[PDB]
Design a protein around this ligand. Structure first.
Ligand SMILES: CC(=O)N[C@H]1[C@H]([C@H](O)[C@H](O)CO)O[C@](O)(C(=O)O)C[C@@H]1O
Length: 307
């Protein structure tokens, strides 16, 4: 009657987040549908490290499940930065097809398993990133000199650089206190994350910059997964796909309602003209291609071929 597999799921997201809620549904489904044989415990709030660290732990066996964006694999395969080049992926359906229907995406999935020890269970939408700050962003000119926190990720650094801001990389866990103490001026994250982390308590302004679309991959250690029998492998996979659908809904539904939530909290929302933002990224696309060469040019081609 005790569990036969005691598995662990680590995440940066906190206990108020859509990601945690969907992870909870995943653990419930797996426990139910395995008839008790699998129990998944959750380790949120970066208590095990950030997402780079948890990825390594899945490879080493010490952690069984985690989340990652397609774009995070730019750390290992630099052309994979295409997923997060600002304004390139314009909606979630493209993000699905970029990963699953392109030669490059399909090859990335195989390398994740053979080289990184990761098996992909499902993909979700994790929102489109927006920009909060302690002063109004009425146009790109207001970004100049803004001390903008970004995650430890080259594409986020590059958004900040190319719009004129002063980037400050730092881990997710440290942002609330950095905004509270105004050691940084702003940050950038999907709207649902601004809510979950209560960044609206320490940011008076929100700008709809739509600059980077985030997905979320449900990952399992390939070692852990291969040790499960085939019928429990199917359980885990079906549970991951159900959870991912719920995960996407949480974020889609929130993007219809969260701007007015923040206005009720007294945040001032702006909708700057995005053509100068998009223009400001054209040099960055040029530099991506210079750095990644033939490979980067081909992934950009495969992604443009998606309607
Ligand atoms: C799966 C995951 O860990 N996502 C985290 C991402 C990625 O680390 C980053 O976008 C680079 O891929 O950054 C955050 O948005 C952030 O620190 O602001 C928190 C979010 O939980």
């Amino acid at each position: 009657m005790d569990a036969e597999y005691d598995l662990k799921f680590g995440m940066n997201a906190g206990t108020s987040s859509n990601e945690y809620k969907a992870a909870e549904m995943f653990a419930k489904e797996v426990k139910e549908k395995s008839n008790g044989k699998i129990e998944i415990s959750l380790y949120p709030s970066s208590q095990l490290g950030d997402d780079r660290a948890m990825l390594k732990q899945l490879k080493d066996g010490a952690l069984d499940f985690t989340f990652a964006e397609s774009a995070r694999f730019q750390l290992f395969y630099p052309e994979a930065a295409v997923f997060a080049l600002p304004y390139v992926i314009t909606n979630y359906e493209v993000a699905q097809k970029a990963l699953h229907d392109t030669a490059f995406g399909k090859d990335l999935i195989q390398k994740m398993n053979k080289e990184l020890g990761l098996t992909l269970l499902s993909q979700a939408y994790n929102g489109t990133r927006q920009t909060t700050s302690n002063r109004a962003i009425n146009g790109i000119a207001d970004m100049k000199g803004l001390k903008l926190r970004v995650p430890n990720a080259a594409t986020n650094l590059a958004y900040a650089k190319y719009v004129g801001a002063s980037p400050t990389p730092m881990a997710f866990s440290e942002v609330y206190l950095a905004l509270q103490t105004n050691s940084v001026d702003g940050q950038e994250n999907p709207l649902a994350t601004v809510q979950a982390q209560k960044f609206y308590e320490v940011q008076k302004y929100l700008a709809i910059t739509n600059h980077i679309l985030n997905d979320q991959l449900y990952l399992v250690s390939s070692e852990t997964f291969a040790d499960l029998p085939e019928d429990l492998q199917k359980v885990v996979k079906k549970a991951a796909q159900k959870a991912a659908e719920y995960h996407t809904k949480l974020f889609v539904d929130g993007e219809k309602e969260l701007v007015t939530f923040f206005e009720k909290q007294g945040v001032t929302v702006t909708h700057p003209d995005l053509t100068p933002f998009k223009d400001a990224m054209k040099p960055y696309y040029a530099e991506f291609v210079k750095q990644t060469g033939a490979k980067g040019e081909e992934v950009l081609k495969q992604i443009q071929a998606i309607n």
